[PDB]
Design a protein around this ligand. Structure first.
Ligand code: TPP
Ligand code: TPP
Ligand code: MG
Ligand code: MG
Lengths: 788, 788, 397
């Protein structure tokens, strides 16, 4: 009798639904007089109205039904919200359940607390309009549309009993990231993971236009959602008496199929991809609000979004209509004299931790356990001489990630956009394979590592791929993202959304526990110009990350494999940061030992003693490199200068943590003025060789005393197709161009080095001519190694 | 049958008691191999041993009995710990109950978590030996001995159903603050407050000496506890079979009397001070540990404190004795294969929020509600002309505190050590009176304001009085402390103890929610030399507070009544600070309006425009004052200089928030370099007139550019008896001495002002001679007022 | 060698030679501070019931010259004992010195008025307080967040009534204790550490050192007959070891560097001669600390106290103080020094920054020192104890 609904409890469900809408309108409009004991006056209304009403009836409608299903089947829900502006619906339900009062004791369940609850919403020094980290039981910010469904799947990536209900707006479904994210059901594993229940809020209208998915035929819509792999269920109408029975029946129909699918998967009798249930709602937008106000339809139209009435203080007629709107819910029966909800509402509320707004999954920091990290020195390469031994840097990282997977089989996953095999990270394929959950052929068995059980997800769309990881970290688990640098502009919008969540959660919100860090690995840098990716790769993703504060993002550019392992090991321990690691796929030199890499990453910036020419004397020039390809050119430039100028004294500095360049005033993590002056001399010129746009170094090191003597060579532009050496020549980061620049800046080499500067220009022209004749660099360029 | 014990449950209680002691020794000694699956080896033992063992058996003994009693009577307990070094006992019980695993997911209830649990204790990057804020269910740090009983009463000051069980060591009872704190039962109100059950751990030995209270006769000890007003109960012996029955019976005897007392008080039939229950334990120190190790008695002696055996790694014989010590608890039956406690231990543990280590009272920030306070502008005095109207500054504050009491009748109390009437704070006596709960005479009714119900605590022992407030804030309530400045050295030790609690809770601990701030009001400054207090008052309390970091303490020196109200209003909103407010009882001038005071306290330090001589031109000298008495002298010096030097341009600056002087690098609260240079110009001399030791200003403003031009006048020494004017002359903070100082620093007044400097010295000599003949200052000195 | 044992033997000899007008006071820390040498001839006084277990373990008898009680307030015994005309000695932890904060100000008030204002008051014996188990060692007893702030509040009182002594080793401790038992109208605060340490001064050399109060250590000083490049000064005893260890590192890595080592025992000698006749003159101060070379002061306690005393000096702007700032929850003795930057490596880093001709030459060494800081912290986290060569360090020259 779960599908059927009793009439007596339907009134209580409707009573909860009315109370949620009453509190929703109250915080949008009312500033004082919460229970309308006295007649409404303009001083009780907020001066500026930034709330959104169009999505509020739908979210409150679904939420009360879900509480009914939790009471019977003892489920656990999260309710990630799609539209994101339906926060008044969420906060009203959280207040009714008592969760909001427990989290915020000021907003007590009383008349005075109700006045404070309405006052704080959409107000300075108060909670925001969208669902922010201050909102209890929320993981998705929802301000940017299209990433809600991916966050639903990410939260259930390794929780078997968890159920998540994501409400999808029809306008939101027009976005590109949401269109692809439907296919994520295939990657989800029914045996060991939870179930996601997507709900489509097809109200029919956007802010100003009819939605695309509402103006397609019912047959076309059913065809479209069958192709995504979901079982479509349709709930239509605008009569609450009809809608309560139908929507309760459909929810009970879907959850039993969800339990049937999960039980069949765990039993192993049905090892195939099932059609997941899904619910479609055709309820009009704002169907519980005013119908017509100014001669136009304000219910079930685009006018219902965020503005029922434009002016209330100016026009007393609208205020009277507003007062009649609040009276339509009959608030007198819903609340007692004290202002608390009546005993009818208290009984039907979930009890204890089962409340969706109080679920520990949403505050994933409490659920988070520290990762078990094997020592990376086992997988580190051995270097007898720094700069003379050549080995690929991807293989040590792949072995290290494999060991973490075995030691952390549940709370760790790896993400790649069909580049894990390309990135030479096949070491993790030894113990675990990619998860596909589709039809397979024996040709696939020999070719690709595909299985139903796996810890590596591979989908081309980085929008849904990165969305999975963000929810995975906010749930309390740990993850790692590896991709090319050329396609990092795709996740540019999503990174700012996640960095916004961490920034507010760290400072403003006090009950939010810290979650795991966001680790993104960028490979196949712009300098190598691999076969994949467009010809004009852009390292501009590093710049937009630096626009965000240094207290939420960290950028690491390790030169070799050992320094890459130390960065990867250290970043897997951090909590409230976004870690961007820029390594290169191609085989390179190795400069640091396993022990020396740990000391290097501890400081972030360090002098390389073997590369440095003279110690115990003031250097004539400081040569600095940041990336790994540009580090080789910086080292090669040092070899040329030491060969031609034996008396020249060169200090070589390699930087891994970019934000160490920022002064100590900007952030405590940055180097102090005395520390910076020790590394980079106060007066001698600095020849910085930076991977990426050369101006980024000037932004960080602007406040430094020696900023005027800082010279940066970096990425400027790229030709259609170039050799690795020729590309460095055009950007003037080549070994010869750096050696030319050192001659210019050093005061006593501008006259002595004229002959050498002429010789270097001959070498630039000679290598370019050989590149045009043969198409490949000279063998001594490719096989170069440190001569000292 | 609550007093009696079943034999079967006694074994489970003993099983819990053994497991707590086993975990206690494990974290003191073991670093690896928690369950002793393999034979013990020296690499499993911690190299440096800092944990304390002497108090551990006693604390674990009481804790398990309390969990027995909390299961049957469904009570709520806090268990404030006296010795403070019994943290291994508390952490073991918290781990057994599952609270520690929930708070710290790394220390999971498993074999791996047990290894981590033992490893972290007394280790770098781990929990400390004493009861730190990291310890769940702890409000008292316990490192300083003697303040535990006051914290027991403070936590129950307004929680009626709460029960607090504070364990008192016999060596701790020799301390002065603990001896007085016994009388706090009289001030506790049984009708509206909880009951505190003190327990004496009379183990007989200190770290090196027999305790005083164990070496007195049983008759005299019983006489002493009767004099304190407690009903003494004695539990003795060293046999666990006997001790389990007797101690459980005594606990059941005491709690029913506690419930009888509370029920009788709330019924109103017994309105008299009752004899509260008291428990004495004669159990030997470390009576569950080794007896003899090196030919000396290590059980029940002073050797049992913190060192069972001195060396374990060096001597394998002690390691064998250590291994036999762990085997004596029979750990195999207590834990399963996974390492979790067996089902016998799980059943007897408290369930949910009823756990003593998981009570929300201990983490009072969750329980804290924001204080509802009226607008202070209602009680602010009216000033038509600044500096010309004379009114006492204490009366507006007393009225403001009275209004807060009415609006917050439950979560607010006021504390004053026999000086609330002296400080002219009788405005709060209008609505509420001080609580005494003793015999009363009609002479007391007319003279004093005493009643059973009250919100003002009055006891001149500043030790026990300040201890009540600290627990009251950590419980989540709000309070206010008002006392003389002369006796502020008494609570000097307690402030440092509370400051280190807030410092750790803010930064290191993440689950600690912010508590209310500590507001201390200092009256009767050293300059007025009131009748009370010693002749040589010391303002040195301000200096020791500044030794603590600026991010945990704030010091405010409001000049007048309106600025006092703004400071008091602002500090009642703050959360994680110690607020020290220094004002003077004596009637003074008024300089700021109600609106202007709010702007002044917003900036903290600002230019007084009316006192400033010339605007739109560079001032010749900056005259700054910090206190209130010295502000009058600074203003009077300005009047003299403007009278004798019409062309002189003087900028007057008043400083209220002391820590604003610190540079922005030291703390974000401090003024920036540009802001400081605007207030005090970069080149002109600054004549600072500071209440207190003059060097404190140089400590704060040391890093400033214009520090070398800063001249501070302040308290140096005080004669035996002096007039208020003559005392300023001795310390050279008088109006004439300040005017003399300005003449010296200003370059163009050193020659022109020679005649005026001679005249000022005549005025100094003239007033001193009049003071010797008459004993009082001249009438125009006392009735001075701003002439412009 | 441990520095507590020579003081205990000396206190025992005073007790026998002065059986009536001398007593010792300790708040259950005389045995803790390894002062059991006085237990040989005299025992603690209890006057209560006794058991044979107490007889074997504790030294208790009806007749005794050592007072033991937990409450430091009932220091009140000693103050009246001195005003009676007799002599005493107080030994306690530094962590609980804030307890007697109010009482000390009362006694110093009495002495200052009696010395100057009152003429018929005859001088009485001095108040000698010994503070043991300093904040740097972090012993098992006491709260983890020990505060050396008691030294600061004593300095707030006039230099004519309070004297603060920080002897580095056992011999310098005896000379301070011997000298302070002769003084009359002063409050003597002696800060020594319980734990076993190095020894730097001979019996004769300690007497000369305490006579001057502050003096150059010739063996620790690098070059004589030439102007030193930097002056390394230490005041306490734990920080003296770090100051010496920093000197060893700099002399090893910079053979040409000239370092003058100065040790300060009497704190108030830093005050100028104008403030008090006891303080050093301007010429004497300029001889010890050069007028232009940087001074790397390593002070036990709050680092600002040195700036208060030496504010009026000509070379105050070149004075750099490293001292106690904050303490972690639990740390190794070396790790605690790293947090407050008084470690041997942090001092060596500060010398490199301050010396003008080492800011460029010492960049490699400064990088090496930062590696040593990180390496020792990592070893501390893995093992919980410092490396064996750190604990067993000794002067290599
Ligand atoms: C990519 C993108 N395009 C446009 C917007 C602006 N926007 C915010 S809410 C909204 C309304 C669309 O919401 P819909 O999915 O129709 O939700 P419903 O009203 O049915 O809840 C729009 C256009 C946005 N945030 N992101
Ligand atoms: C005022 C003060 N003096 C000395 C100490 C040093 N101390 C720390 S713990 C301790 C032992 C306290 O003895 P007791 O109260 O008998 O405790 P238990 O026997 O239960 O360990 C002492 C003396 C202190 N903390 N405070
Ligand atoms: Mg819509
Ligand atoms: Mg004891």
């Amino acid at each position: 009798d779960i599908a059927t609904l009793s009439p007596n409890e339907q009134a209580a469900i409707d009573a909860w639904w009315r109370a949620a809408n009453y509190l929703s309108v109250g915080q949008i409009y009312l500033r004082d007089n919460p229970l309308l004991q006295e007649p409404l006056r303009p001083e009780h209304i907020k001066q500026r109205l930034l709330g959104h009403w169009g999505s509020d009836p739908g979210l409150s409608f679904v939420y009360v039904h879900l509480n009914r299903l939790i009471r019977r089947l003892d489920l656990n829900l999260i309710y990630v919200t799609g539209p994101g502006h339906g926060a008044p619906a969420l906060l009203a339900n959280a207040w009714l359940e008592g969760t909001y009062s427990e989290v915020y004791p000021n907003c007590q369940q009383s008349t005075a607390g109700l006045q404070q609850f309405f006052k704080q919403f959409s107000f300075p020094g108060g909670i925001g309009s969208h669902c922010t980290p201050e909102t209890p039981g929320s993981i998705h910010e929802g301000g940017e549309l299209g990433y809600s469904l991916s966050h639903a799947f990410g939260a259930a990536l390794d929780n078997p009993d968890l159920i998540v209900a994501c409400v999808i707006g029809d306008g939101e479904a027009e976005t590109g990231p949401l269109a692809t994210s439907w296919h994520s059901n295939k990657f989800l594993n029914p045996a060991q993971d939870g179930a996601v229940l997507p709900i489509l809020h097809l109200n029919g209208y956007k802010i100003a236009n009819p939605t695309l998915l509402s103006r397609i035929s019912h047959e076309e819509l059913r065809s479209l959602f069958i192709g995504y792999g979901y079982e479509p269920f349709f709930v239509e109408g605008n009569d609450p008496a009809i809608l309560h029975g139908v929507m309760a029946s459909t929810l009970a129909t879907c959850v039993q199929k969800i339990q049937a699918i999960q039980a069949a998967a765990r039993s192993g009798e049905s090892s195939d991809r099932p059609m997941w249930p899904m619910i479609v709602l055709r309820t009009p937008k704002g169907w519980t609000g005013p119908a017509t106000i100014k001669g136009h339809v304000v219910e079930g139209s685009w006018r219902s979004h965020q503005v029922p009435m434009a002016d209330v203080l100016t026009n007393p007629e609208h205020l009277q209509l507003l007062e009649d709107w609040l009276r339509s819910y009959r608030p007198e029966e819903l609340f007692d004299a004290s202002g608390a909800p009546v005993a009818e509402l208290q009984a039907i509320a979930p009890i204890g931790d089962r409340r969706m707004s109080a679920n520990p999954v949403t505050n994933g920091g409490l659920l988070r356990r520290a990762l078990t990290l094997p020592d990376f020195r086992d997988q580190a390469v051995s270097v007898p001489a720094p700069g003379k031994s050549r080995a690929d840097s991807t293989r040590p990282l792949g072995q290290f990630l494999r060991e973490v997977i075995r030691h952390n089989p549940d709370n760790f996953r790896l993400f790649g956009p069909d580049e894990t095999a390309s990135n030479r990270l096949d070491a993790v394929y030894e113990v675990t394979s990619k998860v596909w959950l589709g039809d397979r052929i024996p040709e696939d068995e020999d070719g690709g590592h595909l299985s139903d059980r796996g810890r590596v997800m591979e989908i081309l769309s980085e929008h849904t791929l990165e969305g999975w990881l963000e929810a995975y970290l906010l749930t309390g688990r740990h993850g790692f993202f590896a991709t090319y640098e050329a396609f990092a502009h795709v996740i540019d919008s999503m990174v700012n959304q996640h960095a916004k969540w961490l920034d507010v959660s760290k400072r403003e919100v006090d009950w939010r526990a810290p979650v795991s860090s966001l680790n993104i690995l960028l490979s196949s840098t712009v300098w190598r110009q691999d076969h994949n990716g467009f010809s004009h790769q852009d390292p501009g993703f590093i710049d937009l990350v630096t626009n965000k504060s240094a207290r939420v993002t960290r950028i690491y550019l390790p030169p070799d494999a050992n320094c890459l392992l130390s960065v990867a090991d250290h970043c897997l321990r951090s909590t409230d940061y976004i870690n961007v690691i820029v390594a290169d796929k191609q085989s390179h030199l190795q400069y640091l030992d396993a022990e020396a890499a740990a000391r290097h990453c501890a400081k972030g910036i360090g002098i390389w003693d073997w590369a440095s020419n003279d110690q115990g004397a003031s250097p004539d020039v400081v040569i600095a490199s940041c990336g790994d390809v540009v580090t080789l050119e910086a080292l090669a430039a040092t070899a040329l200068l030491r060969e031609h100028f034996p008396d020249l004294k060169i200090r070589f500095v390699n930087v891994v943590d970019l934000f160490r360049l920022q002064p100590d005033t900007e952030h405590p993590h940055g180097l102090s003025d005395r520390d910076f002056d020790s590394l980079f001399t106060v007066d001698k010129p600095i020849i910085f060789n930076f991977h990426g746009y050369p101006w980024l170094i000037h932004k960080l090191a602007y406040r430094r005393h020696n900023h005027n003597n800082l010279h940066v060579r970096g990425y400027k532009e790229v030709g259609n197709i170039n050799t690795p050496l020729e590309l460095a020549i055009r950007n003037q980061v080549d070994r010869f161009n750096l050696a030319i620049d050192v001659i210019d800046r050093v005061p006593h080499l501008r006259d002595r080095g004229a002959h050498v500067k002429e010789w270097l220009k001959d070498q630039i022209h000679d290598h370019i001519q050989y590149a045009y004749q043969e198409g490949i660099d000279r063998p001594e360029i490719n096989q170069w190694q440190w001569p000292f």
